[PDB]
């Protein structure tokens, strides 16, 4: 420990920069939220998107349903004569990505380049104060770092632990990232980082970019899932107790009636 | 067991989030008050989390097979990212006391 | 047991109480009005969110109980902050099917669709507007046609 | 007199004008402030509506 | 009960500031001395420790929800009967409409 410093650039950096940069957070959820605006929704894609939600409700729950019931419904979906997936065609548009260049395009997109706003809001509080020790890490530092980390002082023989505003305030950034969502909840937007990104639930689930190719997919889908019946064995709880209806029938007792 | 609700499973993982990212913001106030070396300060963070994990499963006890299907999350969970905000609380009082 | 119920209770747990009555959506119209009007002159302070949802609900129960002047005492509330709500114009055709002149209520649904495509709470009130007027096999088509 | 070796790294800097900071810091809470109610009557005005 | 947690960890607060302006004044003595490189009293950090370890107690006590995981149990008292009215489908036609006309 070395380097007396005032007790008046403790007051006047440290707790500014805290509550500029919790106050910015805040201001860009706040924002986002304002200027999320609803995406206009056909009734013929609505119903495509429920047809949909049907046939996976099917696949998803077919166990517990008759047999019959459950040919009928298949039958219905396929149906070589007429068939509904078959007749009903929409339109379609000319598609463009390609195998291998979407299968890098999953890397190539990512999210790589979304650090630059806060390095502009680095840059301009770096700006504001060019001579400034803000603070010493604990942690032990290479010297290699110590041009990103002062960047603005002229020592040589000073260690890399004492840190300049620029570093404090993007440290500062990802130290409030997970308690953000302590005051709002699960889903938080808050995120200083990622400032251009979009972050929400999402508008309107579904996406039927080609609705023709989908509905061919969920036709081979439901022609290969078979059928099993999980009624069909009711001899497990045949032999067995019951003692969980003498279970809160004697808690049922204690409620009167209003 | 067969049939699962995403709603209660959402809800237990928030809450544990909720305890762990608090536990760890206090962890790093008391290291930051006391002040230690790195290797004794990541010890002492490893260590609170552990108490912490324990503390939870005190506060489950018998029934857990009903809140909890499994343990690794209580266990292992938040330790990277409750890391980041612990070393933000830990120099944040470490030198606003001692250097000033 | 009114004033002694009215005694040991808090607007808080009334407030809860029929958030619960909500969420068990029961027909409980009686009761309803009894809490609803009795907190709408004790508190009328705060919660607004609240008390919009509850302003409705007692205006639903009172269509069902006895009471219209309460249904419009909270339809001119209502009115006064959104001008243009659907779903206060869903309310006011119910109550007008619940009167009379059934006809122009369904000339507000018809309005209604014109503005929104997509509003299945007046196809629905329509279907049972059908389903009362005529038979229930005209209602059946069209409770089919709209399910399709 | 004192001599500066290297400028200075220790003292706070003299031009350092308080009301452009002083200004931001009020001007941010105003901000959120404003925004707040915004967002709630947006949602529920999307609610209603 | 709960008042009671979180006034426990309003207090278990309170003393960790306490015991933090306490060591504070001890640097801030240490700095005008020379040499005489020692540590902070141990009273003061086990007063520290004991105000960690009581408000992480409450910490946890004040979120506790853990919902039962089968999504059986919360419709195991709910009624058909409840259920068979439905909020969407309201006929305004019975005789207690006009049993209650006239009061």
């Given at each position: 420990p070395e380097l007396l410093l005032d007790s008046n650039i403790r007051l006047w950096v440290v707790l500014p920069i805290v509550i500029i940069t919790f106050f910015v957070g805040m201001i860009r959820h706040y924002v986002s939220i304002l200027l999320q605006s609803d995406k206009k929704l056909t009734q013929e894609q609505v119903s495509d998107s429920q047809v949909l939600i049907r046939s996976r409700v099917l696949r998803e729950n077919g166990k517990y349903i008759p047999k019959q019931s459950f040919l009928t419904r298949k039958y219905y979906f396929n149906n070589p004569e007429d068939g509904f997936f078959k007749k009903t065609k929409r339109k379609v548009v000319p598609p463009s990505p390609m195998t291998d260049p979407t299968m890098l395009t999953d890397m190539?997109?990512?999210?790589?380049?979304?650090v630059l706003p806060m390095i502009l809001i680095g840059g301009w509080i770096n700006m504001t104060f060019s001579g400034f020790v803000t603070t010493k890490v604990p942690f032990p530092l290479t010297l290699r770092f110590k041009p990103m980390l002062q960047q603005g002082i002229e020592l040589?023989?000073?260690?890399?632990?004492?840190?300049?505003?620029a570093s404090w305030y993007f440290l500062n950034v990802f130290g409030l990232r997970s308690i953000y969502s302590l005051?709002?909840?699960?889903?938080?937007?808050?995120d200083q980082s990622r400032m251009m990104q979009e972050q929400m639930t999402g508008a309107a689930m579904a996406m039927p970019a080609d609705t023709n190719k989908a509905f061919k997919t969920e036709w081979e889908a439901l022609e290969l899932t078979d059928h099993q019946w999980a009624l069909d064995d009711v001899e497990e709880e045949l032999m067995a107790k019951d003692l969980h209806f003498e279970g809160m029938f004697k808690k049922e007792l204690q409620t009167s009636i209003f | 067991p067969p049939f699962i609700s995403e709603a209660a499973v959402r809800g237990n993982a928030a809450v544990l989030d909720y305890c762990r990212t608090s536990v760890s913001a206090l962890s790093g106030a008391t290291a930051g008050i006391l002040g230690l070396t790195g290797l004794y300060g990541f010890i002492f963070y490893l260590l609170a989390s552990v108490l912490l994990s324990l503390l939870l499963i005190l506060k489950a006890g018998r029934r857990w097979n009903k809140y909890f299907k499994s343990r690794r999350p209580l266990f292992t969970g938040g330790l990277i990212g409750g890391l980041f905000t612990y070393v933000l609380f830990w120099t944040f009082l470490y030198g606003m006391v001692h250097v000033y | 047991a009114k004033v002694s119920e009215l005694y040991d209770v808090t607007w808080e747990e009334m407030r809860d109480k029929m958030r619960k009555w909500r969420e068990e959506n029961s027909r409980n119209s009686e009761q309803i009005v009894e809490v609803g009007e009795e907190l709408i002159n004790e508190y009328?302070?705060?919660?607004g969110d609240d008390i919009w949802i509850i302003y409705e609900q007692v205006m639903i129960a009172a269509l069902d109980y006895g009471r219209d002047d309460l249904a419009l005492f909270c339809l001119q509330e209502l009115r006064r902050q959104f001008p243009g709500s659907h779903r206060v114009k869903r309310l006011t055709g119910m109550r007008f099917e619940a009167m009379e002149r059934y006809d122009d209520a369904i000339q507000l649904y018809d309005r209604i669709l014109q503005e929104d495509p997509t509003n299945t709470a007046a196809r629905k009130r329509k279907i049972a507007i059908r389903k009362a007027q005529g038979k229930n096999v005209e209602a059946i088509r069209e409770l089919n046609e709209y399910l399709e | 007199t004192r001599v500066y070796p290297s400028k200075q790294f220790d003292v706070l800097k003299?031009?350092?004008?308080?009301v452009l900071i002083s200004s931001v810091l009020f001007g941010l809470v105003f901000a959120t402030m404003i925004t707040k109610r915004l967002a709630q009557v947006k949602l529920l005005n999307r609610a209603w509506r | 009960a709960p008042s009671l947690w979180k006034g426990l960890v309003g207090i278990g607060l309170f003393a960790l500031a306490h015991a933090a302006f306490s060591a504070a004044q001890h640097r801030s003595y240490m700095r005008l001395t020379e040499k005489e490189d020692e540590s902070l009293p141990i009273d003061i950090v086990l007063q520290t420790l004991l105000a960690f370890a009581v408000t992480c107690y409450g910490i946890v006590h004040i979120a506790g929800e853990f919902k039962d995981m089968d999504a059986t149990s919360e419709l195991k008292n709910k009624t058909f009967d409840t259920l068979?009215?439905?909020?969407?489908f309201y006929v305004f036609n019975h005789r207690g409409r006009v049993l209650f006309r006239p009061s």
């Open positions: 190539m997109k990512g999210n790589v380049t979304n040589l023989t000073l260690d890399a632990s004492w840190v300049s505003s005051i709002l909840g699960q889903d938080n937007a808050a | - | 009328a302070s705060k919660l | 003299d031009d350092y004008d308080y | 068979r009215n439905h909020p969407s």
